[PDB]
């Protein structure tokens, strides 16, 4: 169970977790105690895995990680909303490719500045099957592998840029790779012990 290699989601030690890949046998996720997990991949297709919550919110999250990408990969707060269907990213670090596209401005929060981009993803896998949907991006100007993310400040920034979110679905601190190799170990948590709304 702890070593996931098949599409799967669930709960581990209180944290929701999700694993998805279109390339079987090229990547695995290992769930550890608390809010920790690891990933290892090699010449994979595409995958997204991480721990977090099944219902996103304006959470203030703290994480620490070892991110060792060998090519295209992301260390990012990742999530989905419905109606409208939106896949969003708060990118903390990346490999060889830095997310880009239509510049919507910037947002300063948690000791750093992030560039804001909005792009489209065509006929791609989603929490609602094969769909075309928009992607909201907050990309830090300085890569980092630990710190705090006041998610609320990003949502506000996106909103002020005409990027409207829908009804929140899952929200996780994820590792995503694309036709690359690498590994990661990520530890995340929320401030205090408020529970889930
Ligand atoms: C988890 O569920 C995923 C679905 O969300 C599974 O993804 C599928 O993974 C298989 C490989 O096991 C891919 O099969 C290949 O398909 C390509 C053609 O791809 C194009 O057409 C499909 C049509 O559905 C489209 O989805 C793609 O985006 C491409 O446009 C062939 O050339 C290969 O020979 C091979 O058949 C599927 O493409 C892929 N589908 C999706 C939705 O991405 C995934 O397998 C599951 N993971 C595990 C570990 O089982």
What are the boundaries of each domain within the chain?
Answer: 1-197
- CB within 8 Å of 97: residues ≥ 6 apart: 72, 178
C-alpha span between 184 and 68 (Å, rounded): 6
Residue 125 Cβ contacting ligand 1 at under 6 Å: yes
Pick the residue whose CA is nearest to atom 9 on ligand 1: 22
Residue-wise burial string across 145-171, b where 16 or more C-beta atoms lie within 10 A, e elsewhere:
eeeebbbebbbebbeebebebeebbbb
How crowded is the C-beta side of 145, counted as CA atoms within 13 Å?
Answer: 11
Is 87 a known active-site residue? yes
Query: Are residues 65 and 82 in contact, defined by beta-carbon separation less than 8 angstroms?
Result: no
Spatial distance between the Cα atoms of 93 and 69, rounded to a whole number of angstroms: 10
Task: Say which residues have a Cβ less than 8 Å from residue 167's Cβ, sequence separation at least 6.
Answer: 81, 82, 83
CA nearest ligand 1 atom 45, residue: 22
Q: Going by CA atoms, what residue is nearest to atom 17 of ligand 1?
A: 22
Measured from the Cα of 24, ligand 1's closest atom is 49
Question: Could you tell me the distance, in angstroms and rounded to a whole number, from the CA of residue 78 to the centre of ligand 1?
Answer: 21
Q: Which of 112, 77, 87 is nearest to 168 (CA)?
A: 87
For the chain, give the secondary structure using H, E and C.
CCEECCCEEEEECCEEEEEEECCCCCEEEEECCCCEEEEEECCCCEEEEEEEECCCCCCEEEEEEEEEEECCEEEEEEEEEECCCEEEEEEEEECCCCCCCEEEEEEEECCEEEEEEEEEEEEECCECECEEEEEEEEEECCCCCEEEEEHHHHHHHHHHCCCCCCEEEEEEEEEEEECCEEEEEEEEEECCCCCCC
Joined tokens for residue 81:
């909303």
CA distance 43 to 27: 9
CA 146 to chain centre: 14
Pairing of strands 73-82, 86-94: antiparallel
2 lines ligand 1 (CB under 6 A): no
Q: Which residues pair with 16 in a beta bridge?
A: 11, 52
* CATH topology classification for 1-197: Jelly Rolls (2.60.120)
Paired with 49 in beta bridges are 19, 175
Q: Token pair 């769930």 is at which residue? A: 31
The radius of gyration computed from the CA coordinates of the chain, to the nearest angstrom, equals: 15
Q: Is the CB of 8 inside a 6 Å radius of any atom of ligand 1?
A: no
The whole-angstrom separation of Cα 134 and Cα 165 is: 10
The verdict on whether 176 is a catalytic residue reads: yes
Q: Of 178, 191, 172, which is closest to residue 10 (Cα–Cα)?
A: 172
Q: Which of 8, 21, 22 to mutate to test ligand 1, by most ligand atoms within 8 A of the CB atom?
A: 22
């Amino acid at each position: 169970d702890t070593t996931i290699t098949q599409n799967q989601t669930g709960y581990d030690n209180g944290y929701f977790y999700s694993f998805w890949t279109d390339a079987p046998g090229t990547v695995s996720m290992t769930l550890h105690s608390g809010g920790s997990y690891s990933t290892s991949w090699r010449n994979t297709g595409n995958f997204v895995a991480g721990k977090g919550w099944s219902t996103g919110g304006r959470r203030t999250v703290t994480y620490n990680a070892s991110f060792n990408p060998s090519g295209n990969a992301y260390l990012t707060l990742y999530g989905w909303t419905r109606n409208p269907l939106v896949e969003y990213y708060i990118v903390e670090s990346w490999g060889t490719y830095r997310p880009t596209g239509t510049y919507k401005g910037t947002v300063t929060t948690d000791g750093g500045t992030y560039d804001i981009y909005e792009t489209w993803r065509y006929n791609a896998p989603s929490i609602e099957g094969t769909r075309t949907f928009q992607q909201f991006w907050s990309v830090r100007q300085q890569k980092r592998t630990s710190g705090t993310i006041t998610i609320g400040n990003h949502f506000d920034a996106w909103a002020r840029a005409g990027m409207n979110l829908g009804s929140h679905d899952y929200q996780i601190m994820a590792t995503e790779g694309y036709q690359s190799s690498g590994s990661s170990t990520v530890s995340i948590s929320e401030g205090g012990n408020p529970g889930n709304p």
